[PDB]
Each structure stands twice: as C-alpha cells, then as structure tokens.
Design an enzyme around this catalytic site. Structure first.
Site, mmCIF file in Angstrom:
data_model
loop_
_atom_site.group_PDB
_atom_site.id
_atom_site.type_symbol
_atom_site.label_atom_id
_atom_site.label_comp_id
_atom_site.label_asym_id
_atom_site.label_seq_id
_atom_site.Cartn_x
_atom_site.Cartn_y
_atom_site.Cartn_z
ATOM 1 N N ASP A 104 -24.822 -69.773 1.467
ATOM 2 C CA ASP A 104 -25.083 -70.619 0.317
ATOM 3 C C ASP A 104 -26.605 -70.605 -0.001
ATOM 4 O OD1 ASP A 104 -25.457 -73.815 -0.600
ATOM 5 O OD2 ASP A 104 -23.760 -72.762 -1.540
ATOM 6 N N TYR A 235 -32.112 -77.404 -5.475
ATOM 7 C CA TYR A 235 -31.627 -77.055 -6.819
ATOM 8 C C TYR A 235 -32.623 -77.303 -7.948
ATOM 9 C CZ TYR A 235 -26.720 -77.249 -5.095
ATOM 10 O OH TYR A 235 -25.539 -77.066 -4.427
ATOM 11 N N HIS A 293 -15.386 -71.842 0.049
ATOM 12 C CA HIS A 293 -16.850 -71.873 0.099
ATOM 13 C C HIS A 293 -17.442 -72.047 1.512
ATOM 14 C CE1 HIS A 293 -20.984 -72.482 -0.995
ATOM 15 N NE2 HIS A 293 -20.977 -73.616 -0.321
HETATM 16 N N1 LIG Z 1 -28.330 -68.847 -5.667
HETATM 17 C C1 LIG Z 1 -27.623 -69.749 -5.487
HETATM 18 C C2 LIG Z 1 -26.791 -70.872 -5.266
HETATM 19 C C3 LIG Z 1 -26.658 -71.406 -4.002
HETATM 20 C C4 LIG Z 1 -25.846 -72.501 -3.811
HETATM 21 C C5 LIG Z 1 -25.187 -73.020 -4.903
HETATM 22 C C6 LIG Z 1 -24.319 -74.185 -4.791
HETATM 23 O O1 LIG Z 1 -24.398 -75.007 -5.687
HETATM 24 N N2 LIG Z 1 -23.486 -74.267 -3.710
HETATM 25 C C7 LIG Z 1 -22.357 -75.124 -3.829
HETATM 26 C C8 LIG Z 1 -21.430 -75.441 -2.702
HETATM 27 C C9 LIG Z 1 -22.383 -76.483 -3.197
HETATM 28 C C10 LIG Z 1 -21.867 -77.698 -3.857
HETATM 29 C C11 LIG Z 1 -21.538 -77.729 -5.196
HETATM 30 C C12 LIG Z 1 -21.064 -78.875 -5.795
HETATM 31 C C13 LIG Z 1 -20.906 -80.024 -5.058
HETATM 32 C C14 LIG Z 1 -21.233 -80.010 -3.722
HETATM 33 C C15 LIG Z 1 -21.706 -78.859 -3.135
HETATM 34 C C16 LIG Z 1 -25.318 -72.491 -6.166
HETATM 35 C C17 LIG Z 1 -26.132 -71.401 -6.348
#
Ligand SMILES: N#Cc1ccc(C(=O)N[C@H]2C[C@@H]2c2ccccc2)cc1
Ligand SMILES: N#Cc1ccc(C(=O)N[C@H]2C[C@@H]2c2ccccc2)cc1
Lengths: 314, 314
Positions: A104, A235, A293
């Site tokens: 991730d 983020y 995921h």
């Molecule tokens: N490059 C890149 C990149 C890395 C990570 C993510 C991401 O967002 N991971 C998701 C699992 C997490 C999430 C999403 C929504 C709610 C809770 C957890 C998006 C883009």
C-alpha cells in the site's frame, strides 16, 4: 504473534523523530514497510517465515504509526522527507543496503527508495502498489476526476475530518476495514457527499474471517497513542510528491524488482500495474487469487511463498 | 560514540526483565558483554571497527546496568540465571548462534555460555578473564582467602556497604576507577581492614589520559538510574556459581576460542590463564603490553586488531 516475544528497536532519525521497528532473524537485511492504516504487526505472518528462510527482518512502524513519532505537520509526511528518513535509518543501523518490501503506502515508499536511493536498496518488492512514472501533464488531483475510485482520497484531504470519524470508535474502524473483499461493507464511489466513510455500515460489524478479536484489539491499542492524523497525512502531499517524482522521471529502476498483485484489491487493482515492464523490463511478478487489499493478512501462505522464492532467486 | 546516533534495541527475557543493547552493522552477530562496573559504552571503540569489518554488533547493557533491568535480588545475578537469559535473548532475536566477546564479569559470562550452551555460541573471546574449571575441593570463598589481591571482593559481599561508597560521588567513583595502571590511586590489596575502597584516595582525582570528562559523565548518567546494587550483585553468588560450574562434570569447550591477556591488569593477571589449553584444546591467544584492566579504553587499537584478525579467521 506476541509483541513481548519480539526484539524492539528504536532509531532517532532527527531531533523530533524516531522510528520503531521489530527485528527477527539473521542474514541479509529485509525492511518491511506497511500501508494505511496499519502497523509493523500487519507483517506478523511474514516476520517469522522470512527469518526462518534465512533473513534479518526489520518490520517498521512507519512514521505516524505505533511507537514511531507522529508529528502533526502535513509536510513531515511527503515522500521526499519520508525517504530521507529511511536512509538515515539505514545509516544509524550501519546497513549499506537492505531489501525493501512495501505494501500500500509502504509500497509507494519502497518504489521511491529504489528510484532516488538505488545505492541503498539491494532489491525492491511491492504488494498491491504499482510504480507509474510521473505524468508531466496531469496533477494527482486531476487523476481523481479521471479515475473516480480514489474519491475517498478527497475526503482524506481536510485535516480533522477523517481523523474524527476514524478515531470515534477504533474497534469498529478496524473491524470495518480489515475484511476479505467478499465481506466488505464499504463502497468507494462517493464518500464525502455521502457524509463519511462509515455512514452506512454496521454499528457493530462482525469479525472478518481474516482476523481474531485479539488481533483487532492490538491495532486499537496502537492507534490510541497518536490516532489518525499522521497516517492520514500520507495522503495530503499529492502535489509535493508529484513534483518530486518529476525530478526523477528520466532514470530507471535497475535493481531486482517484484510486483505482487491481488485479484480482489478493488482500490489498487492488478491492471493498474499492467505496463510496468515498459519501464522495468526485468520485473518479476506474483499474483494472488481471491485476495483483497489486506494482502499479508488475507493470503499469508501465498505471500510467504512468493516473497521467499523471489528473495532466494532475484 | 554519540548514543543518539545508535540503534537501541530492547528484548524482554522474562516478564519483568528487559535487556537493552546498541546495534550496528551487518553480517554475523557478535555479542559484546561488558564488565564491572561498566556499560555497552565501554565497547565504544570496538563497535564501529567491528561493524566496518563486516559484523553485526550487539553491545549489551548487562543485567543490572544502564537501560537494562536491575532487580534488587542477589539471586537474579548468579551465572546460571544470567546465562539462561542470554539464551532467551538470542531466541527472541531469532539468532541460532552469536559470537560472544566478553571482558571482566562479561568475560566470565561468555566462558559459561560457551561451556553450557556451545550450540548457541559460534565462537568465544574473553578480555582479561580466564576460564578455570571448578575445583570440587576448594570453595570460591577459600580461594579468595588464599590470594590476598581479592580482598575488595569480601568488601563487596555485604549488601548496602560498597553501594553507599560507590554511589556517594559518581564522578569521583568513575575517575578513580577508570585509570591506566601507572595512574592508579587505589588499594586493591587491602580494602575491608581500612573501611573503604576510596578512603585513602584523592577526593578530587585527576582525569586519566584514557578518558575525557564527557566520557566520564556518560557513565555517571547511566548509573543514576539503578546505582550499584545490581552490578555488585554479580559478586554475591560465588557459592552458587561454583555449584553450577561443577555440574559441567569436567566437559571441555570445543568451539573456537580466544583468550586476550593484559600485561598490567593486576586483578586479572595474565598468569591466571596459563594452563587454559588443557580444557580448551584449540584455544587462540592475544596479549596486550602496557595494558591495564580497562582493556577496551586503554588499548582500543590493539583490541580492535586482535578481535578483527580472530573473527576473520575463526
Ligand atoms: N500510490 C498510492 C496509494 C496508496 C494507498 C492508497 C490507499 O488509499 N489505500 C487504501 C486501502 C486504504 C484505505 C482506503 C479507504 C479507507 C480506508 C483505507 C491509495 C493510493
Ligand atoms: N571471574 C571473575 C572476576 C571478574 C571480575 C572481577 C573484578 O573484580 N573486576 C574488577 C575490575 C573490577 C573492580 C574491582 C574493584 C573496584 C572496582 C572495580 C574479579 C573476578
């Protein structure tokens, strides 16, 4: 996995900031980097397997998490700063190089490490997270309009908002998130107009097949110290990260590389990685069926086998 | 060494006992075990040199010292308990074997590690401290009565007594102790009669050519946390240690081993090691001229040379 049965290491990488890790095994150094919103403990199945396979495993709490420092400032979690800290980590431990394996957000980190610090990265593996060279034309905010599956990311931008929701009930947070794709109670189409991430999901979600109550409670305890501000800040540096990636986009990853895809990851979709061999011709691959995921937790046996094979070969 | 430039590790070996260590480098594990009344920091000149030489260094705070646990009970510091703890240390770190290098009391410990746990000890080296198999006839108390140079040891026996003298002025304590042999201000021959180890010695000792004020003040700060009770307890288990040593039943040490003697150590004299090849066939030797008791501090270049040569061959 019992934490008190583990060796815990601590490295101050700058005055305000120390990184915690768990360490097991002897042999070549392998640094494991978790994603959002996770822990060194997300690697609990890989730690003993890799150590038994003949490796010295360093499983990080990434900056913002667990026993590592979590300064509040957004700019402390841009990729450039996060990567320089991981290089200082290696320096202080006296490691010339390490294999980096990320998942991730940790996977994005390990690709940037391989890119900007190839002299310190023996080999690179990512779970779920592809490596795409920066696009000089589109901003990262523009890519959310083109690809609407990343709409929760806009919800994550405003400081205080996602934090308040995710911290309200930690047990419910982790039970809602950590689930097999077929058990999922969350949709990524429109989140912030819907009011929030959990607005229409059970108040007392059942425990997923993947996790025990005891494992859920470990995450709960971990996130009590610093909460979600630091983690969410990962983020909140899209433009800075994009501009830094642009400073590289000519150069190539030349070290051994592994891209592991998960069939049922609906956010980091396998196809997002399809043309990676165009910029990494020697790239090796793994693919895991029926895998959501939360790769390491969902299919630990399969993860262990894929990583050990690759570690033992290229 | 700058302590905040180091990786600090912690391993819980029993519910209420944690061992702290500093870790530097990659390669085969080499565990450094300091003496009385010292610190991981006594290995400051060896840590970087051994790491540079291709080794993963784990420099301990031994039980009773620094950031390691220091329970008050005499019995917690018998060699049998201390050794079993060091095996648990290896277990938790996931290390099948380590090279063990000790000095002074840490030297005694590594001999017992090699003797009772050879499967966990890749190779063993001691600075100053010989290994002499237990004599089933003479008690350790009777042996102290024979050689008059160990009178300070009797003075160390009654709990509270030596503590109060060593804790009174920590700076004076360490400045009086850490001195080259030609600089020594202490009466080791007869202590208990006089009523004090520092009774005759200068109230404001000068600084040995071996140490800076900054180095002395590090030891002072470490000993503020737990004081001298734990360290002194190492001396208070003579009969138990003898009884354990007898359980070896004249078995030999068969692993690679190095005995390093110091010409000017007047407590652990080079002749005390002279017949060691009879119970350690392969034994290798080093000897440092113009070297007093504080070997690592007194002759760090020579120590480094001797240890690296031996590690690389054996
Ligand atoms: N490059 C890149 C990149 C890395 C990570 C993510 C991401 O967002 N991971 C998701 C699992 C997490 C999430 C999403 C929504 C709610 C809770 C957890 C998006 C883009
Ligand atoms: N086996 C064994 C063994 C280990 C250690 C000693 C010992 O006594 N070391 C000396 C240096 C320390 C000391 C002595 C007096 C005052 C301050 C420090 C004696 C026997």
């Amino acid at each position: 996995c019992n934490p008190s049965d583990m060796s815990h290491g601590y490295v101050t990488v700058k005055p305000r900031v120390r990184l915690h890790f768990v360490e097991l095994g002897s042999g070549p150094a392998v640094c494991l980097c978790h994603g959002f919103p996770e822990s060194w403990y997300s690697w609990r199945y890989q730690i003993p397997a890799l150590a038994q396979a003949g490796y010295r495993v360093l499983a990080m709490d990434m900056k913002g998490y667990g026993e590592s420092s979590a300064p509040p400032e957004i700019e402390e979690y841009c990729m450039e700063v996060l990567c320089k800290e991981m290089v200082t980590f290696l320096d202080k431990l006296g490691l010339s190089q390490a294999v980096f394996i990320g998942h991730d957000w940790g996977g994005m980190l390990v690709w940037y490490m391989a890119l900007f610090y190839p002299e310190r990265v023996r080999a690179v593996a990512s779970l779920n997270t592809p490596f795409i060279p920066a696009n000089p034309n589109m901003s990262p905010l523009e890519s959310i309009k083109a690809n609407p599956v990343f709409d929760y990311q806009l919800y994550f931008q405003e400081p205080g908002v996602a934090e308040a929701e995710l911290e309200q009930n930690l047990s419910r947070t982790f039970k809602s998130l950590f689930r097999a794709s077929d058990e999922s109670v969350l949709s990524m189409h429109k989140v912030c107009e819907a009011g929030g991430l959990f607005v229409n999901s059970p108040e007392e979600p059942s425990l997923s097949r993947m996790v025990t109550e005891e494992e859920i409670q470990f995450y709960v305890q971990q996130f009590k110290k610093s909460g979600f501000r630091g983690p969410l800040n990962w983020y909140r540096n899209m433009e800075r990260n994009w501009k830094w990636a642009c400073k590289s986009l000519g150069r190539k990853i030349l070290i051994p590389a592994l891209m592991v895809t998960a069939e049922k990851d609906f956010v980091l979709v396998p196809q997002m990685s399809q043309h990676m061999e165009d910029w990494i011709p020697h790239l090796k691959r793994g693919h895991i069926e029926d895998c959501g995921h939360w790769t390491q937790m969902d299919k630990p046996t399969e993860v262990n086998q894929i990583l050990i094979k690759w570690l033992d070969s290229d």
